[PDB]
Design a protein around this nucleic acid. Structure first.
Lengths: 79, 93, 100, 104, 107, 81, 99, 107, 93, 104
DNA sequence: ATGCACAGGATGTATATATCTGACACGTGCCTGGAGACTAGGGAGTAATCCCCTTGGCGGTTAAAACGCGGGGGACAGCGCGTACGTGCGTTTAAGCGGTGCTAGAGCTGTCTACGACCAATTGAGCGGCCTGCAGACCGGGATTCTCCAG
DNA sequence: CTGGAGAATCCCGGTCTGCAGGCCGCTCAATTGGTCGTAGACAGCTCTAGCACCGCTTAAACGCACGTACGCGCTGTCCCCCGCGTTTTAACCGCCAAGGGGATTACTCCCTAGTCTCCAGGCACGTGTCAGATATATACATCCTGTGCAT
């Protein structure tokens, strides 16, 4: 049930490395998880909204694309 | 010519909530701009919803979904309840 | 008299920064992120099914967001004459971005 | 003491280290027995002549990379016991005092 | 029968007919349902009522009987969800919230 | 019309920073603030004049400025809307 | 026989409180009008201006500058300083997205 | 006479008729002019050509004959105006530009 | 059924600029998303411009003004040049 | 030296301060003349009895605020001249010497 | 004994060749979406009119800007410490992949019913113009608060 | 701590005025009632892909030891920005005058929507190479610690 712990410390470290971060405090990882969770909520909610307007039960890639577009994060490569 | 605004309806609502409170012309202009901006946001989102689902009509379901998409938290739930109440009262009478 | 070889602190880190700024693959594991997505999508609706491309797009967007936030966090940490990122750096970055 | 996969100790100058055995040598048959099995000397495996005729052991040292595997004869490798760990600490203190004399 | 406005039919203060005309004239869709202007007018009326109530509280706190842009700004920025809604909006002659960082306080 | 950015004086920038909650200001801040203000004004006025020219007008109206501000993600209430 | 001067930083807080309470414009109007006209000179010649357009420009510009100073102050406090510096402004504008 | 496309008349490679249909059916205005789809198709083709030229350059610098998302990301982010145009756009499987801050380098 | 895209035209433009360079399917999908996004931005800005001036027609002047409003610096100049050249060639022919 | 609007330099203890004058007194007529003016003594204006009968002047000090205006007579108000500036610097130097003796 | 400057072993990164695959490019059938032709009427272009509001000038007052200066306190640089990070190795874990299986639900088609556009007559809600009393702005002088320093 | 002193602000009457709010005439957009066509609600069918289970395999995560470099507290210097008095400038107000251009109204005409007919551009699907993947076997380039020079 603790699926936020599945976003492990090495993965956050890899993301920081791609972000150009050399040294990472020990308190970062938990903090990072929090931020990620919030972001996901803000997207997933909106996605589900579209899924419920179309009277669908399956969330499609276009619902995610629309939620991202309306939150100011346009994404290419998924339709 | 003649220009239309929401001033009289804003004044009615103000006298409903605060019967002994006035309002200046600048504040009324700001409130009119607020109403117009919210109208544009909701209408544009409803148009996008209709287009996404291959529909030609903007119904109250599109308005409700746009309100849920554009309003945060408790505002969205209260607005949805108010809109449902208004539509029910309109359909009954 | 035998010594074991080991680089100094800050060498493997730079090697990894060069490695991961060169590739484009996703960095989070797929099944854990899928379980996280499916759990978060339960305070909204029950028995939701997901297209594979939906989860793929979610992972792309979330990793891009995290990488950009880490870049801003690194700038914030450097501004304070440091090389280590701390939670206050993330908080300041999100406050200036407008998220807070 | 001396078995495939069992722990053993090994000398190096004035210090000692724990290693894991993987190939035990029989010189009369010129074959090593290995665990992932009597097999001859390989296309790259080879032992010097002063230890190829004795009971040799191909060991990998614990705490050291897999590039430093060593074919040690019966001269250095001892049977793993607590007295061997006591000697390990003996040489550890020897090196500690030697370095402390090098500085102080 | 005598004319009865749709606003009075739905029990609203905002004009349902004007909202319907604006929805039809805005190139939003080919056609507009009958219950969409009622819903939209109800939502706009509720939001106007919320902001007006908070601004009236903020005006009575400052001991005045009229709402000025300063009171609207105070009401919006003190309310968390209204601040989220009008987060990228500038209210003319509204000023700012009086916030001072603790590290700058005299010590 | 030349060298009017120096009409945005140091006391005015100081008052703007006081309203922002700033207690102590380095002396190299005023020129940077003038440059930032120039960039912002150029970006807004370019779009305002584009709107004015599309209408074949010669005077910039408040609505042109409002639309320019809205296009840049800065909605302004209270100027005609 | 002492001039009775205040300590460095109390008048600054006093005017912080003074200007965080009022709502009027903080820039002079004629210099800002001249600056607006000079900037617009390079996009179209013989342009006219409504007074409300200049008013809207001034309101938006001062709101923008006040918000930028609010971010600059956080950036300066992050460096454990009390004085704002141009690098604070640059970092704020870069994190916002303007750089 | 025989059918001749409008893109051929305008000297374009993008479909003028399809853009005209997408303008008519998109709820943008009541009427669409005759020269609007031609202008729009020309602008779209110009932007596509700019991006594809830069991405082909990037693919050649990597000694590849096919453009992948990485080349598009490099082309967009290394060009200043194209980076400003796609400021809030996330390209999937594109990565980031290789950039390490100076103070993090070994000194 | 059949789903339309801009793939063939992007491929023709690619073979004009780099006559020996290919393109993968993911990159082509990204280019299709880019074309759709630009189309939507320009059409929306043109519609807003038409509504602002109380006009029912989206002409090429609306497109030109939208392009000048949405594209930065030299991109706007070059795009306007291409659009004017295409319109002139289309009308003359 | 001594005129309305003209400068003056007057003692105050072991130091002097330089001021600008606004009122000229006349004890024979008991009236002051000022500039924005033979006028009787003010309802809020007065002079100490040791200088109200002498040639007094209402001075405003330079470097001081507009509230330290003082009625000083010819006992302290001296003639602003070159020697006056010299003795101003002289008592400034002696004040510096006294401060250094308080410190070092 | 300390900062400089080489030698060299370790190690992880880039090059070179080779083999294989599946992803891209090309080829063919077809069908529906665009092109050609034509009509009508209304949106837009043009010309005349007006009168508003934008620009320009000039004089007087004084608020605000500019300027000079002494001094506090804040910036910043250097130093010492200890501990919280990085590195690397042995071990455990679960992700990844391939496979089999089932069915919920996405997607599509056909029918026809109710709902929304459209139009003609009616009229009252809302806009504009006009007026006026009071909420609020502006004074001014006592009252009270806040800051500073000296004891 | 702790009175005083000086400055800043607050408070409470008294006067004056612009505009907020109410009234009024009128007109044009909302309402009502009836027609009609078609969008989508609804029911049914297909078959796609999403969820579930399971068995190997090995890459990755995890735990832990060790050490060192960095974050942080502390101290000292100096310089630069603040508080404040004095002089200077030009912002603001008021008042007026001319005319440019935005808004309005009438008239016309051409250009775009609508409709029909037709045919080829583009799309869906089927094949076949070869660019890229993947694997293994070598040059480089750095990292880093041990050499010497000698100050």
């Amino acid at each position: 049930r603790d699926n936020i712990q599945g976003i492990t410390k090495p993965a956050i470290r890899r993301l920081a490395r791609r972000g150009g971060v050399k040294r990472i405090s020990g308190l970062i990882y938990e903090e990072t998880r929090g931020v990620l969770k919030v972001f996901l909520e803000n997207v997933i909610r909106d996605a589900v909204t579209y899924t419920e307007h179309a009277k669908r039960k399956t969330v499609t890639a276009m619902d995610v694309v629309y939620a991202l577009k309306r939150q100011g994060r346009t994404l290419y490569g998924f339709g | 010519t003649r220009k239309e605004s929401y001033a009289i309806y804003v004044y009615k609502v103000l006298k409903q909530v605060h019967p002994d409170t006035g309002i200046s012309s600048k504040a009324m202009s700001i409130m009119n701009s607020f109403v117009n901006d919210v109208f544009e946001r909701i209408a544009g989102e409803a148009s996008r919803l209709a287009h996404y689902n291959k529909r030609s009509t903007i119904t109250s379901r599109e308005i409700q979904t746009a309100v849920r998409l554009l309003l945060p938290g408790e505002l969205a739930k209260h607005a949805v309840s108010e809109g449902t109440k208004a539509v029910t009262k309109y359909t009954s009478a | 008299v035998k010594k074991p070889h080991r680089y100094r602190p800050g060498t493997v880190a730079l090697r990894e920064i060069r490695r991961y700024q060169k590739s484009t693959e996703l960095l989070i594991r797929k099944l854990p992120f899928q379980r996280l997505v499916r759990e978060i999508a339960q305070d909204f609706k029950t028995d939701l099914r997901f297209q594979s491309s939906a989860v793929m797009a979610l992972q792309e967007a979330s990793e891009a967001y995290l990488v950009a936030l880490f870049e801003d966090t690194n700038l914030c940490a450097i501004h304070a004459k440091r090389v280590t990122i701390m939670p206050k750096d993330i908080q300041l970055a999100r406050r200036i971005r407008g998220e807070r | 003491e001396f078995a495939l996969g069992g722990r053993c100790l090994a000398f190096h100058g004035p210090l000692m280290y724990e290693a894991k055995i993987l190939k035990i040598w029989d010189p009369s048959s010129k074959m090593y027995t290995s665990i992932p099995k009597p097999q001859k000397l390989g296309e790259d495996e080879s032992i010097p002549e002063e230890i190829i005729n004795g009971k040799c052991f191909f060991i990998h040292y614990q705490g050291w990379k897999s590039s430093w595997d060593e074919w040690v004869g019966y001269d250095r490798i001892r049977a793993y016991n607590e007295e061997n760990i006591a000697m390990k600490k003996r040489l550890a203190n020897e090196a500690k005092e030697a370095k402390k004399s090098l500085l102080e | 029968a005598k004319a009865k406005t749709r606003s009075s039919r739905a029990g609203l203060q905002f004009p349902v007919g004007r909202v319907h005309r604006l929805l039809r004239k805005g190139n939003y869709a080919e056609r507009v349902g009958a219950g969409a202007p009622v819903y939209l007018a109800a939502v706009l009326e509720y939001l106007t009522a919320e902001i007006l109530e908070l601004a009236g509280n903020a005006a009575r706190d400052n001991k005045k009987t009229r709402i000025i842009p300063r009171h609207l700004q105070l009401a919006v920025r003190n309310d968390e969800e209204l601040n989220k809604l009008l987060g990228r909006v500038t209210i003319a002659q509204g000023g700012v919230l009086p916030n001072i960082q603790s590290v700058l306080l005299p010590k």
